[PDB]
Amino acid sequence: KRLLNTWTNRYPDAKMDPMNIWDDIITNRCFFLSKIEEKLDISSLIRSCKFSMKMKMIDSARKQNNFSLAMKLLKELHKESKTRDDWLVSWVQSYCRLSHCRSRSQGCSEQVLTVLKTVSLLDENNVSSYLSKNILAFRDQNILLGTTYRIIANALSSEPACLAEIEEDKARRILELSGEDSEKVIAGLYQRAFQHLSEAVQAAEEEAGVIDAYMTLADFCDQQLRKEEEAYPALVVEKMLKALKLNSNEARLKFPRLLQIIERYPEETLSLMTKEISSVPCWQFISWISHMVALLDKDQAVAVQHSVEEITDNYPQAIVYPFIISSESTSTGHKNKEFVARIKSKLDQGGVIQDFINALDQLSNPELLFKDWSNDVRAELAVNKKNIEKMYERMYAALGDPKAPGLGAFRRKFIQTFGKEFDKH
């Protein structure tokens, strides 16, 4: 039982099922523990069980956004936290996660009033129990540290005249200590938060929270870039790339940001596009196939065209059509032409798809194309009789010719009945 009772008797609907039911359950649990012990180390066991259920309680209520927590029970666990270092630091982490959650709308001033609750509750009391505990809690503490530092820096940047900033207190000095100058303070805060995020990343990589650290650092760097516009880029994009290696939907969604940062700073991404097969071989970006097949005509990251080449090898389908639409449209652009030549060679009897599309097109009303081209002739008219002749040949092969593939009859006879129409004028 002292095992089954664990996990609030198997989480009775965590993150849902309002705390009322949870409160009833925990009341039952503690009552049963009292009954059992009173009729009987073991007391320490049941007290640890109570610790566990109540921390699950507070975690869930925070997850249910019930900022009206068991604040009093939170403080009860606070007093009882000192009973042992592990339970103490677990309470500390719960409180800090609450406070970060408590940063809701007035997070700036209210969080400054309680800067990481005296910052990591002065975790120097025992840092991961002097690291004698796991690196798990260790990187969690680093996450909290960087999180609060980032929150404060964003608060100061958004509000450079906060009332708590106006409030002259001890919080000022540590503000400059962890940060002097307001811009200098926020720069130092961002630097320290980045340091803590890096610590959390490296701790996670020792053995998923690793992906979580990657995503947090990606958010950090994206903020850096956004504020640097209206150092970081290399390592941050490589880290989020290693994250997407551990395939994740959001890690997928960071792909267009990767493209943008490659465009803005191709320098380091050149060293980083080197690791694109070696960084992630997972066959993805099918939802992004447009993004690099348009890039196929460019050389911004040749390893991306190698990636899509490998995809086409694995997947001779679903790439042929983006490849065609890209081919519809130097010292290295010749390499792009080599790329497209290689891909079209890799098209297994691409004439299959070509004749298929032609068969589709025989259904289309050619007068539509003729009208669009009657517009195109004036689009070119305002260059003339050199591209006008090119489309003249295009419109010909469409209708001026009397013969065409496809075993249709309607258009297959209109081509031959109006090639004269096309040629006479």
Local structure of 170: helix, strand or coil:
helix
C-alpha–C-alpha distance, residues 67 and 299, integer Å: 52
What is the maximal distance between C-alpha atoms in the chain? 110
The experimental method is cryo-EM
- For the CA atoms of 3, 8, 11, 13, what is the dihedral angle to 10 degrees? 150
| CA 203 remoteness from chain centre | 20
Its sign, for the CA torsion 226, 232, 233, 237, is negative
CA neighbor of 211 nearest in space, from 253, 252, 242: 242
Instruction: Decide: residue 79, CB within 10 A, 0-12 exposed, 13-18 middle, 19+ buried.
Output: exposed
The dihedral formed by the CA atoms of 170, 173, 175 and 179, expressed in degrees to the nearest 10:
-170
* Helices and strands (DSSP H and E) totals, the chain: 24, 0
Residue 234's closest CA among 198, 272, 195? 272
Q: How far apart are CA 398 and CA 406, in angstroms?
A: 13
Q: Do 144 and 116 contact (CB within 8 A), yes or no? A: yes
Q: What is the DSSP string of 343-397?
A: HHHHSTTTHHHHHHHHHHHHHS-HHHHHHHHHHHHHHHH--TTTTHHHHHHHHII
Cα 14 to Cα 61: distance, rounded to the nearest angstrom = 9
Other C-beta atoms closer than 10 Å to the C-beta of 338 total 12
In this structure, are residues 231 and 195 in contact, taking their beta carbons and an 8 Å threshold? no
Record the resolution, in angstroms: 4.5
Residue among 52, 61, 66, 69 at smallest CA distance from 13: 61
The C-alpha atoms of residue 153 and residue 157 are separated, in whole angstroms, by: 6
Nearest in space to 91 (alpha carbons), one of 73, 103, 107, 114: 73
Cβ proximity of 200 and 213 under 8 Å: yes
Residue positions counted in the chain: 425
Radius of gyration for the alpha carbons in the chain, expressed in angstroms and rounded: 32
Sign of CA dihedral 92, 95, 100, 103: negative
Residue among 127, 265, 95, 279 nearest 196 (CA): 127
In whole angstroms, what is the distance from residue 376 CA to residue 262 CA? 36
Compute the distance between CA of residue 204 and CA of residue 138 in angstroms, rounded to an integer. Answer: 9
Show the tokens assigned to 49.
Answer: 């069980």
Which DSSP category does 106 fall into? S
